[PDB]
Design a protein around this ligand. Structure first.
Ligand code: ATP
Ligand code: GDP
Ligand code: MG
Ligand code: MG
Lengths: 352, 208, 51, 80, 132, 101
């Protein structure tokens, strides 16, 4: 009631809906978010059998910016930042849902930290002998990309011939889905296929064929360090990974026709202290220079209204099973123990 | 201990202190004034006044702690309470409107009852009589029943039979069985009950 | 790695403060240490240990 | 080199280079031929932006210097 | 600025805390210049800071600025608990102070690490005894 | 008049080791680098291996100065634990007491 909004169109959300939960339909959830949703938020969808996202000011601000986007100008970079667990990822998801219902082409990188960390199969790129390719990481992403942008994957057609190997090759003019299918099928060409997909969407959005959203969660991974090591145990730089090298190019505002929304994350990062959350703190010198100029959007803890609306939404699902939680003294403790942090609250309520 | 025998234990109960003075009996009133003169031990870092405080969960958490690692012991505990709640929400959502009335989704109710179904009513005390030991049936104090129920549940979950099952998974499964009077911890209670009934003729060996 | 300026600066500071200026490996810096103190046998506690 | 300097200088930096290219792209988008670098990088706005990035790079980063940098960039790029 | 506060000290093992409790506030605790939720990521630690204010029904009514040093995280939480409870005694009634004393909230915990003794393994632990 | 012949053999070792310390230092320095030619360092090896064995400082033993004990000596006082305690227990070592805590 007081925690839910009937407005399920992410394009008609205004300040009047702040604090209220809007329902992401199972259709959009399966299509727009086959990846990228917070793990603890994917658990909650299962147990409540519905995905309801709170309309908050961080996302509201972005929607505003992305409604007044001048597609003639270069791509604006927006950067969500905030302390751990404040809702940066679900703010970014709110936005993605918006653009997907506006028929933008979505280029969602679920978590970029995965690309600099825990890589089993690290092959030397054939296209460039100085770089490494990540078939597993590259293949996984392509499948999800295909899910989200299946309608547009045929209409879009390559503008150049890409030779996979001696035998196979994509010929100019063929549909883009064919390039994605090569990567999905031959994971040896998955990294090279991802490079081509990025190379085309950037080039063709400037031509005005579609609007492009580049949404990179955990963007601070691209200019940091990796835990990947060579055969001789020497550390590999993010510049050397073919998959990171190509995504870096998507972050420059030298293309137009879309927007670049990103979110920072210390969770899952490499070589960053627990409490680092400010943009230059997490990006470093190299990373900050690569995004200058960008518009920082702050995400913070629930304000008293947001906090109350969350509790009511948990009570409304009978999630708060303890006998004292509905009480006002129960709420005071939830509030204290979390400091209104969205993540601490959710984690605390998953057993109370 | 570093406390002298003079220090008394703290009573951490909000409502106890916020009870109307008139309701206090003459005896209850006196003890309340006596404590105004007594030294009180510092409240330990475990129990607080919170409304969510449960002494049975706290004891169960400590009984599964290894080497002072209470952050890990409690994380397992809350992951178990969460796994139980999620298993009971899946079962409730897939149940018919008639069955739904039955299904308990409160994990604290389930945990509390799950352990109460494992507590034994009688035990066995080895009594050395005539150079031979006899498992004599004896009544058990309530503390010992509640200890045994928790200890049997934890020892069952820590058995190596379970291959690569995480403790929150194992324990939530075992707690749900015991909630329905099933499983190997309920069985261990019955085997104890059967032993004691079989040796009911030896109960005269007890001298207390 | 050090930039040429950073390198040429630390060599200038070393000349000023009287530290080794030539690039020297750790094995050869023992020569400096050897002559930077007294030999153990020359220290008073050693050669004058007994009354 | 820039790596050796212990003080950030905005002149001949990335942010100087980047904000230059960004505005030229914005002008080309409007089909304007006013491409004088000195004209572009002279406005009072570029100065406030320059203050913010140098303030970020040289003193402690806090949510106040981030908010200040935001209003500068938000104003150069015509984001309302 | 004319704001009322009391400040007190607390000590737990090798940790020492100083708390400034403001007569009026929102529930903001700032340990060593950091929010209490970020200084103490462990819940049990945050539950110890709640304890003083919850017991007297004053969660969300005061601001706290504390500093703590020494010990480990949980001994720091218990030193801050004691420092905050003591400073909070100025803003509650004398009956509420007594109840806080009888809840054990106002006592210095004397339990501190005991020395190892020679010829033993630990403070109490003995080396294996060999009958034969 | 030293406590025994083992002390007397250490008295001589300490004295000889002192006599040759400068020579030993100089020769080590030659052979303790990568700068010099190996044919020269090899000569140095031979040279220092030819100095009397009792000039080698590792052969000095810190014996109790009072009783000649080769182990159990506190180095600040050069005394064995038996001798140290005897003076400490009678009150004759300035500022040293039994520790209790
Ligand atoms: N807008 C929202 N609607 C509903 N729940 C939310 C919202 N924002 C946060 N939450 C809850 O709080 C949790 C915050 O996690 P989330 O991934 O959104 O944050 P984050 O800032 O990206 O985190 P991290 O610092 O770990 O990267 C979510 O899992 C969900 O439980
Ligand atoms: N196998 C293969 N991969 C390509 C080809 N063209 C681009 N890619 C991939 O996509 C990325 C695009 O890089 P880019 O330098 O912009 O390609 P270019 O425009 O041909 O120079 C490359 O790093 C490759 O991983 C091609 O012809 N064959
Ligand atoms: Mg995140
Ligand atoms: Mg021990």
């Amino acid at each position: 009631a007081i925690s839910r909004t009937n407005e399920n169109d992410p394009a008609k959300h205004g300040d009047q809906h702040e604090g209220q939960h809007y329902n992401i339909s199972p259709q959009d959830l399966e299509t727009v978010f086959p990846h990228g949703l917070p793990p603890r938020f994917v658990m909650q969808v299962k147990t409540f059998s519905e995905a309801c996202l709170m309309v908050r000011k961080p996302a509201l601000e972005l929607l505003h910016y992305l409604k007044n986007t001048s597609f003639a100008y270069p791509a604006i970079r927006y950067l969500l930042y905030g302390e751990k667990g404040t809702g940066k990822t679900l703010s970014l998801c709110h936005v993605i849902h918006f653009c997907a219902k506006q028929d933008w082409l979505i280029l969602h990188i679920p978590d970029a930290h995965l690309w600099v960390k825990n890589c089993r199969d690290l092959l030397q790129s054939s296209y460039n002998k100085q770089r490494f390719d990540q078939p597993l990481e590259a293949s996984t992403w392509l499948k999800n990309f295909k899910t989200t942008n299946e309608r547009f994957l045929n209409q879009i057609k390559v503008q150049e011939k890409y030779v996979w190997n001696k035998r196979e090759s994509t010929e100019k003019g063929s549909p883009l889905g064919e390039v994605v299918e090569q990567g999905i099928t031959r994971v040896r060409n998955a990294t090279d296929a991802v490079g081509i997909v990025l190379k085309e969407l950037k080039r063709q959005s400037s031509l005005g064929m579609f609007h492009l959203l580049v949404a990179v969660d955990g963007i601070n991974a691209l200019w940091g360090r990796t835990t990947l090591k060579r055969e001789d145990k020497s550390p590999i730089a993010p510049e050397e990974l073919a998959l990171v090298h190509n995504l870096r190019k998507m972050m420059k505002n030298d293309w137009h026709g879309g927007a670049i929304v990103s979110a920072l994350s210390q969770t899952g990062s490499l070589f960053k202290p627990r409490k680092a959350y400010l943009p230059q703190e997490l990006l470093g010198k190299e990373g900050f220079d690569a995004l200058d100029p960008f518009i920082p959007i702050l995400v913070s803890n629930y304000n008293p209204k947001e906090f109350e609306s969350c509790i009511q939404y948990y009570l409304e699902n009978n999630w708060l099973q303890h006998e004292k939680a509905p009480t006002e003294e129960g709420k005071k403790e939830l509030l204290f123990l979390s400091n209104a942090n969205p993540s601490l609250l959710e984690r605390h309520c998953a057993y109370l | 201990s570093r406390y002298s025998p003079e220090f008394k234990d703290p009573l951490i109960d909000k409502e106890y202190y916020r009870k109307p003075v008139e309701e206090l009996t003459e005896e209850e009133k006196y003890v309340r004034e006596l404590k105004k003169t007594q030294l009180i031990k510092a409240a330990p870092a475990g129990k607080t006044s919170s409304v969510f405080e449960d002494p049975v969960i706290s004891k169960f958490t400590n009984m599964m702690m290894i080497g002072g690692n209470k952050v890990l012991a409690r994380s397992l505990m809350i992951q178990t309470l969460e796994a139980v709640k999620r298993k009971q929400f899946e079962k409730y959502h897939a149940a018919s409107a008639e069955e739904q009335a039955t299904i308990e989704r409160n994990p604290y109710t389930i945990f509390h009852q799950a352990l109460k179904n494992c507590e034994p009513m009688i035990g066995l005390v080895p009594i050395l009589k005539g150079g031979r030991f006899y498992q004599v049936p004896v009544p058990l104090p309530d503390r010992r029943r509640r200890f045994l129920a928790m200890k049997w549940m934890i020892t069952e979950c820590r058995d190596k039979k379970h291959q690569r099952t995480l403790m929150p998974e194992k324990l939530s499964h075992k707690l749900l069985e015991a909630f329905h009077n099933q499983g190997p911890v309920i069985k261990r209670k019955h085997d104890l009950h059967k032993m004691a009934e079989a040796n009911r003729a030896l109960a005269h060996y007890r001298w207390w | 790695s050090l930039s040429e300026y950073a390198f040429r600066m630390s060599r200038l500071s070393a000349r000023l403060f009287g530290e080794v200026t030539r690039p020297t490996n750790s094995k050869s810096m023992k020569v400096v240490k050897l002559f930077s103190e007294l030999p153990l046998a020359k220290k008073k506690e050693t050669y004058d240990w007994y009354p | 080199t820039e790596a050796d300097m212990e003080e950030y200088i905005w002149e001949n930096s990335s942010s100087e280079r980047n904000i230059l290219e960004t505005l030229l792209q914005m002008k080309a988008a409007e089909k304007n031929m006013e491409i004088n670098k000195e004209e572009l990088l002279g406005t009072k706005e570029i100065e406030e932006y320059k203050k913010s990035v140098v303030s970020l790079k040289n003193e402690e980063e806090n949510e106040n210097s981030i908010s200040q940098y935001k209003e500068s960039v938000k104003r150069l790029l015509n984001v309302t | 600025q004319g704001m009322a506060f009391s400040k007190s000290e607390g000590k737990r093992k090798t940790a020492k805390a100083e708390a400034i409790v403001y007569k009026h506030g929102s529930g903001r605790i700032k340990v060593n210049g950091i929010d209490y939720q970020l200084y103490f990521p462990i819940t049990q630690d945050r539950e110890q800071l709640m304890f003083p204010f919850h017991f007297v029904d004053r969660l969300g009514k005061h601001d706290v600025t504390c500093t703590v040093s020494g010990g480990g995280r949980s001994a720091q939480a218990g030193a801050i608990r004691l420092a905050m409870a003591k400073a909070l005694c100025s803003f509650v009634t004398e009956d509420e102070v007594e109840w806080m004393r009888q809840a054990g909230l106002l006592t210095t915990d004397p339990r501190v690490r005991e020395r190892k003794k020679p010829g033993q393994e630990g403070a109490r632990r003995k080396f294996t005894w060999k009958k034969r | 008049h030293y406590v025994d012949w083992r002390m007397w053999r250490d008295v001589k070792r300490r004295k000889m080791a002192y006599e040759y310390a400068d020579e030993r230092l100089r020769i080590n320095s030659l052979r303790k680098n990568t700068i010099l030619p190996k044919i020269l360092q090899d000569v140095a090896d031979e040279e220092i291996a030819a100095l009397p064995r009792d000039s080698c400082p590792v052969r000095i033993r810190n014996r109790c100065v009072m009783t000649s004990r080769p182990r159990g000596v506190k180095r600040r006082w050069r005394l064995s634990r038996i001798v140290f305690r005897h003076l400490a227990d009678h009150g004759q070592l300035s500022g040293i007491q039994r520790a209790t805590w």
